[PDB]
């Protein structure tokens, strides 16, 4: 059972498949947050060429919730979900940012290339199935000293085409 969604940004759109079959809690949380428009106006605030771009931080929203929460009632962090068939290989892997074991809230990254040292440290919960060339343009974005793009792509909306929960 998979979820399907489009992230529409000020600098391109991404078509995404969610692995609700292998990472149900992370997909559910994400879709519950999509439901209440949580990601609208958030940016992609960290971008490293040949690695990944990172988004989903409530605290950096350029505007409802001011701090980062999960999609579940209460907003508490949720546990990691790993699967051997899901590895940080190649462009367009959708995965969870964290600060150690079981600290998943709302921040995520999309890979520009393999980074398999992250396997079994980060919940991979999807992949970009369309818009790989938007991603390739993001990879070229000029960034400051802290790796924030000078012009961060900002989420206009997320269109959910299928939520299996």
């Amino acid at each position: 059972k998979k979820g399907y969604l489009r992230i529409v940004t000020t600098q391109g759109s991404l078509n995404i498949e969610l692995h609700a079959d292998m990472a149900p809690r992370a997909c559910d949380s994400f879709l519950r947050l999509c439901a209440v428009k949580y990601f609208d106006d958030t940016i992609f605030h960290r971008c490293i060429r040949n690695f990944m771009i990172q988004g989903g931080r409530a605290e950096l929203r350029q505007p409802q919730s001011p701090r980062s929460i999960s999609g579940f009632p209460g907003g508490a962090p949720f546990e990691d979900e790993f699967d051997n068939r899901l590895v940080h290989q190649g462009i367009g892997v959708l995965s969870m940012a964290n600060d150690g074991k079981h600290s998943n809230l709302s921040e995520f990254f999309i890979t520009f290339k393999s980074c398999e040292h992250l396997n079994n440290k980060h919940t991979i919960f999807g992949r970009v199935v369309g818009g790989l060339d938007v991603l390739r343009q993001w990879e070229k974005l000029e960034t400051d000293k802290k790796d924030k793009p000078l012009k961060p792509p900002k989420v206009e909306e997320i269109i959910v085409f299928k939520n299996p929960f």
Binding site: D99, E107, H117
Partner: peptide
Amino acid sequence: XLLVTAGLVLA
């Protein structure tokens, strides 16, 4: 190094 953290970016 090459991490994806939320607050303390490490090497």
